[PDB]
Amino acid sequence: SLHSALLEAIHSSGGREKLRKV
Amino acid sequence: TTALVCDNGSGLVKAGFAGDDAPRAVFPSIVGSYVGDEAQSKRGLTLKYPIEHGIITNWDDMEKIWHHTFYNELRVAPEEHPTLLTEAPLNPKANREKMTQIMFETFNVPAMYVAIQAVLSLYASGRTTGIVLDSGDGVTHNVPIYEGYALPHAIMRLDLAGRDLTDYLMKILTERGYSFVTTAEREIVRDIKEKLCYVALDFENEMATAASSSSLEKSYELPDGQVITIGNERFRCPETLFQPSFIGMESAGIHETTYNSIMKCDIDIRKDLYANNVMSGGTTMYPGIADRMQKEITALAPSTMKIKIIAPPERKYSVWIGGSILASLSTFQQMWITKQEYDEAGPSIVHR
Ligand SMILES: Nc1ncnc2c1ncn2[C@@H]1O[C@H](COP(=O)(O)OP(=O)(O)OP(=O)(O)O)[C@@H](O)[C@H]1O
Ligand SMILES: [Ca+2]
Ligand SMILES: [Ca+2]
Ligand SMILES: [Ca+2]
């Protein structure tokens, strides 16, 4: 479903390390 | 087309660009008109906080804060940027609508979204189920969350947070003869709090250590050369979180509100809550707070319960970071409220 895809993406986002360093 | 994330708190605005690892703009949520840092330097107009205990209560001043955020801090044209905003747990529906109306009608955003703060902090730790303790400058909440849904009967609000702790440190600093009274002086005491305070692993035992020698003393020097030295005040200040009677409140402390919140949830979820206690917000930054919470929750929970406190180093900005993550996921992109939807349906669309 919609939500399972979002949920899964949240679980595998890797947190701030995968975001752009300011 | 880059999305913006604006996390509006009682004390501080954190704002920036989705996809960044931290908010570029962090400034006081104060309107003096002047906004933010401008307003404090020119204390002399009076200062008003448009957000009280997490809830927007002054809409005219809130609008000045959002304007200052877009134009002076981030230097953007809001009409070009989808904007993700945050709200307190249990924010009334009417407030959510009015935030939506101001964003689309005053600032002309192409799209927007409002997320619950604690839920964003949970997302920032890689989780979709858990229990967040979010404690800022104006309010503390316990928010149990099941697959992204805050469980409304188990949410706890506690009007005890950073500003109360700052005020309490101002009061107990008089025991050593120091006098901090002025609003400027409150900002000084806030910084002392942040630099020197800590949570005792055991309060009674720490009190005894502090009475028996000066080994716990630390000093903070003001620009005029006054040296502020404190001992047990260092840990008495944040002890208030665990013992609100210190400031004349009847409430249970944060360990107990955490337990009580878990106990208002279905027994079949409690295990995962106990094992995923996430700490969020500036008032959870005290050294030792994670180990104290672990100890206190252990004393409250069933004896075999696995207890885990997650206290990320970035937790002054966890709400914001969760928003940044959420707003830049491809799987989130269909969940923006678009200006076309607002144009046709109006504010009440937000509850969709
Ligand atoms: N290192 C620290 N030690 C103790 N307190 C801290 C520390 N760093 C920040 N704080 C406190 O955290 C508060 C600001 O945190 P935060 O930005 O999470 O709150 P907010 O979102 O403005 O308020 P709220 O969530 O209550 O509406 C202030 O009271 C500040 O003094
Ligand atoms: Ca990286
Ligand atoms: Ca906050
Ligand atoms: Ca059940």
Backbone angles phi, psi at B66, to 5 degrees: -65, -35
DSSP string, B280-310: ESGGG-STTHHHHHHHHHHHHS-TT----EE
Q: Tell me the two tokens of residue B342.
A: 């607002």
B84: Cα separation from own chain's centroid: 17
Q: Can you say whether the dihedral through the CA atoms of B270, B276, B281, B283 is positive or negative? A: positive
Whose Cα sits closest to atom 24 in ligand 1? B136
Which residues in chain B are closer than 8 Å to A4, comparing Cβ atoms? none
Please tell me the number of Cα atoms within 13 Å of B131 on its side-chain side: 31
Q: Tell me the two tokens of residue B209.
A: 């250590």
Q: Tell me the two tokens of residue B290.
A: 């994670």
Q: What is the dihedral of CA B270, B240, B120, B285, to 10 degrees?
A: -110
Q: Give B112→chain A minimum CA distance, Å.
A: 18
Q: How far is the CA of B343 from the centre of ligand 1 (A)?
A: 37
> Which residues are placed with Cβ below 5 angstroms of ligand 2, an ion?
A 17
CB-based burial label for B338 (10 Å; 0-12, 13-18, 19+):
middle
Cβ–Cβ of B128/A11 closer than 8 Å?
yes
A19–B contact, CB cutoff 8 A: yes
Which ligand 1 atom is nearest residue B165's CA? 29
DSSP secondary structure code for residue B74 in this structure: S
Give residues (CB < 6 A) around ligand 1: B 9-12, 54, 136-139, 161-163, 190, 193-194, 197, 281-283, 285-286, 316
Distances (CA, A) of B142 to A17, A21, B48, B135, B154: 26, 30, 27, 9, 8
The chain B residues in contact with chain A (CB within 8 A) are 16, 19-22, 24, 123-128, 147-148, 314, 321, 324-326, 328-332, 334-335
Q: Which ligand is nearest to the CA of B139?
A: 1
Q: Which of B84, B90, B149 is nearest to B114 (CA)?
A: B84
Cβ–Cβ of B329/A9 closer than 8 Å?
yes
Distances (CA, A) of B109 to B25, B59, B68, B114, B130: 19, 18, 15, 13, 32
Residue A20: count of CB within 10 angstroms of its CB: 13
* CB pairs < 8 Å spanning A and B: 60
B41, amino acid identity: S
Q: What is the dihedral of CA B330, B336, B339, B342, to 10 degrees?
A: 160
B259, amino acid identity: Y
Cβ–Cβ of A22/B124 closer than 8 Å?
no
Locate the chain B residue with the closest alpha carbon to A13: B126
Q: How far is the CA of B256 from the centre of ligand 1 (A)?
A: 21
Q: How far is the CA of B72 from the centre of ligand 2 (A)?
A: 29
DSSP string, B124-141: HTT-SSEEEEEE-SS-EE
Q: Which of A16, A21, A10, A8 is nearest to B115 (CA)?
A: A10
Whether the CB-CB separation of B201 and B276 falls below 8 Å is answered with no
Task: Label residues B150-177 b or e (16+ Cβ within 10 Å = b).
Answer: bbeebbbbbebbbbbbbebbbebbeeee
DSSP secondary structure code for residue B192 in this structure: H
Domains and CATH numbers, chain B: 1-116+315-352 (3.30.420.40), 117-160+250-314 (3.30.420.40), 161-249 (3.90.640.10)
Q: How far is the CA of B125 from the centre of ligand 2 (A)?
A: 15
CB-based burial label for B178 (10 Å; 0-12, 13-18, 19+):
middle
A1–B contact, CB cutoff 8 A: no
Name the strand (E) or helix (H) holding B167: helix B162-172
User: Rounded to an integer, what distance in angstroms lies between the CA atom of residue B72 and that of residue B65?
Assistant: 10
User: Rounded to an integer, what distance in angstroms lies between the CA atom of residue B19 and that of residue B332?
Assistant: 13
Cβ–Cβ of B321/A19 closer than 8 Å?
yes
Q: Which of B74, B318, B325 to mutate to test the interface with A (most CBs of A within 10 A)?
A: B325
DSSP string, B19-73: TBSS-SEEEE--B---BTHHHHHT-----B-SEETTEE--HHHHHHHHHHIIIII
User: Rounded to an integer, what distance in angstroms lies between the CA atom of residue B93 and that of residue B159?
Assistant: 21
Q: Are strands B83-87 and B111-116 parallel, antiparallel or unpaired?
A: parallel
Q: Which of B137, B196, B189 is nearest to B168 (CA)?
A: B189
User: Rounded to an integer, what distance in angstroms lies between the CA atom of residue B40 and that of residue B222?
Assistant: 18
Q: Tell me the two tokens of residue B12.
A: 């501080």
Q: Which of B80, B83, B64, B84 is nearest to B72 (CA)?
A: B64
Name the strand (E) or helix (H) holding A4: helix A2-11
Q: Tell me the two tokens of residue B77.
A: 């044209």
Instruction: Identify which of B19, B126, B331 has the shortest CB distance to residue A15.
Output: B126
B162 contact partners, CB below 8 Å, separation of at least 6? B11, B135, B136, B137, B138, B190, B193, B282, B283
- Which residue carries 């960044």 as its tokens? B20
Q: Tell me the two tokens of residue B306.
A: 């696995």
